């Protein structure tokens, strides 16, 4: 019990703020999918 608590606390300490980390991780998907869609569009337009 205590060892698991210490491990969890250490992991949380290493990471950044939970709210910030959660938002950053969630965003990191849109911040990439958008870019990808834009690249695919530009590609198709150039080919056309």
């Amino acid at each position: 019990s205590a060892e698991k608590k210490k491990r969890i606390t250490k992991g949380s300490w290493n990471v950044g703020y939970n709210k910030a980390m959660a938002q950053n991780v969630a965003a990191e998907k849109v911040e990439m999918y958008g870019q990808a869609f834009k690249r695919i569009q530009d590609a198709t337009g150039i080919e056309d």
Partner: protein, 40 residues
């Protein structure tokens, strides 16, 4: 008794879902230039 199995399946399902979304979205980008070669 079954809640260990359900949290394990939850972790597996979230990881599989995330990798599936990325894989599907990237393999879908390929489609508009792979489409000509099926019948042309």
């Amino acid at each position: 008794k079954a809640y260990l199995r359900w949290r394990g399946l939850d972790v597996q399902i979230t990881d599989a879902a995330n990798e599936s979304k990325d894989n599907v979205k990237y393999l879908a980008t390929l489609e508009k230039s792979m489409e000509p070669m099926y019948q042309g």
